[PDB]
């Protein structure tokens, strides 16, 4: 079973084996058994660590139930894949991904003094094609200031920097005006409706470019693995794939008592049973008890 | 779906668009008579407007019975649809069995006949490896783990370049 | 034997989920 801080994550997830374990947990609840008390302790580092290591347990069954739109025609298959990834993110506890990476910039640059510290300590969480375009404008404003541009906002030099960072930002293709006015909010919602429309149509364009870029990478990686695979004769392919499968089976059989090796061999028995069920009735597929 | 649906016998479909199955409704104010024509069988049913509202109560909740996963089935599907692209241009190789005769032998130069025989064996090697279709089920299992490690991030699964650029501009151009 | 279930088959099989659960169960009692 669980330690009951796992099981509060698995209530809203619609994955399969989380649902089966949580239905057995609710069945044990029905027969006069009590819930365990949530430990109201484990200060913020343990809270973020356990959150990070228990959101993996909801994204990782959730990724493998998401079918890629590899080589499909149009745009809307990528929108299916990216909407299903957004739904997986909302079921694993993460927020809307824009505000999630904005939260990460708030976590990384809480205590930065100058804009050069901002472009240093957040280099990995932003594109380098944009980070170089910001470091050049940082040097350009740094030459006229002849001092580091401090991270306040009251500065005139920071305003001259931001007026060209907005310029390179709209030069990249994202309209910075609608994004700043959306996340900065307005009072009357009828005047904010159009800026929410513009932010969302950019944001839909943006996450489709994200998911389609990952799909282009998977397309090229599968094409490269196949183009290296079709150069081999079948003797090398057969002995190679049988040896690699037997090596991973021996590696997952060297571990005993651990849960992951036991579940590994259990799912190996599942795929052997699936081959037997497709062999018994090739017109209907697998036998599913209804 | 949501817990409530708001459709049924109101702006409903009236006819069929195919001849493979024919559908004729007789929708009255209280009930409806759907006499559907389908092959050699035929059914004439009776549903009311509040009888279709009892449809979406217990939801269907479809799922995909897969061999390994739905992700790995999709990558294996793409590998098979690439092997079709390769196989279609092994379908346009010229026949050489029309030139296996001994009349083309002794008119042929020895080096060029040897290179023709090695070319034919090279075609047989290509065609034997491009139709090893049982190897794709493991060939896609090397594309999966880097992809699964790229969706298992510390921030969000579907996060990437341009959304991080938009939030970087939104983070920078605000007042500090 | 045959015709297992439906919910036994919707499980994505060779996902991780259990290396991570084992890492968490040998991490958090060792880091508290």
């Amino acid at each position: 079973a669980v330690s009951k801080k796992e099981v509060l994550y698995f209530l809203s997830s619609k994955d399969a084996e989380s649902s089966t374990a949580v239905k057995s947990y609710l069945k044990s609840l029905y027969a006069g058994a009590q819930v365990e008390a949530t430990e109201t302790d484990a200060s913020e580092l343990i809270a973020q660590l356990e959150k990070k290591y228990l959101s993996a347990q909801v994204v990782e069954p959730g990724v493998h139930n998401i079918a890629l739109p590899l080589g499909e025609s149009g745009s809307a298959p990528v929108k299916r894949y990216a909407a299903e990834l957004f739904n997986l993110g909302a079921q694993a506890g993460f927020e809307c991904p824009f505000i999630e990476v904005s939260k990460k910039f708030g976590q990384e640059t809480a205590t930065s003094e100058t804009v050069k510290d901002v472009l240093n300590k957040t280099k990995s969480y932003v594109s380098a094609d944009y980070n170089a375009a910001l470091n050049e404008v940082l040097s350009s404003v740094e030459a006229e200031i002849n001092g580091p541009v401090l991270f306040d906002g009251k500065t005139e030099g920071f305003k001259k920097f931001a007026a060209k960072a907005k310029a390179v930002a709209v030069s990249r293709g994202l309209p910075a005006d609608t994004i700043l006015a959306y996340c900065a909010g307005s009072a009357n919602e009828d005047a904010a409706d159009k800026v929410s429309k513009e932010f969302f149509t950019w944001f839909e364009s943006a996450y489709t470019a994200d998911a389609a870029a990952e799909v282009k990478a998977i397309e090229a990686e599968a094409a490269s693995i196949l183009d290296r695979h079709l150069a081999k004769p079948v003797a090398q392919i057969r002995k190679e794939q049988a040896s690699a499968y037997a090596s991973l089976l021996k590696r997952a059989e060297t571990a005993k008592g651990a849960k992951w090796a036991e579940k590994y061999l259990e799912d190996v028995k599942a795929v052997q049973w699936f081959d037997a069920s497709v062999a018994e009735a090739p017109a209907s597929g697998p036998k599913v008890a209804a | 779906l949501t817990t409530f649906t708001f459709s049924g016998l109101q702006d409903a479909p009236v006819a069929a668009l195919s001849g493979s199955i024919k559908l004729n409704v007789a929708a009255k104010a209280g009930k409806a008579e759907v006499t559907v024509a389908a092959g050699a069988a035929k059914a004439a049913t009776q549903v009311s407007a509040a009888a279709l509202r009892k449809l979406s109560g217990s939801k269907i909740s479809l799922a995909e019975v897969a061999r390994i996963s739905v992700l790995h089935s999709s990558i294996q599907n793409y590998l098979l649809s690439l092997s079709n692209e390769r196989y279609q241009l092994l379908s346009q190789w010229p026949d050489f069995t029309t030139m296996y005769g001994k009349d083309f032998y002794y008119r042929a130069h020895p080096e060029d006949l040897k290179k023709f025989y090695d070319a034919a064996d090279e075609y047989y090697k290509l065609y034997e490896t491009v139709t090893e279709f049982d190897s794709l089920s493991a060939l896609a299992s090397q594309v999966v783990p880097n992809y699964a490690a790229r969706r298992r991030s510390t921030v969000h699964p579907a996060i990437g370049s341009t959304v991080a650029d938009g939030a970087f501009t939104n983070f920078l151009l605000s007042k500090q | 034997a045959d015709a297992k279930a439906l919910d036994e088959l919707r499980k994505p099989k060779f996902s991780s989920k259990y290396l991570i659960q084992h890492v968490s169960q040998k991490l958090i009692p060792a880091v508290k």
């Binding site: 990995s124 | 390769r86 991030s153 | -």
Partner: peptide, 30 residues
């Protein structure tokens, strides 16, 4: 068909490193 199970967390948000579409098809046409 089974994969090596990796449990590691990608910290960097980067472009996904598209590979080069290889020269197998031009080789087979050659």
């Amino acid at each position: 068909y089974l994969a090596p199970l990796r449990s590691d967390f990608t910290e960097e948000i980067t472009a996904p490193k598209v590979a080069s579409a290889s020269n197998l098809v031009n080789e087979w046409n050659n």
